[PDB]
């Protein structure tokens, strides 16, 4: 998940949701 040009928090993991991407 890298293709956006933003970076969630360090040790979060790429998790999809009902809405849409997000960060877990």
């Known amino acids: 998940c890298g293709d956006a040009v933003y ?3 360090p040790g979060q993991t790429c998790c999809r ?3 849409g991407y997000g960060c877990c």
Do not use: V
Request: aromatic fraction near 0%; proline fraction near 0%.
């Open 7 to 9: 970076t969630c928090r």
């Open 17 to 19: 949701g009902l809405h």
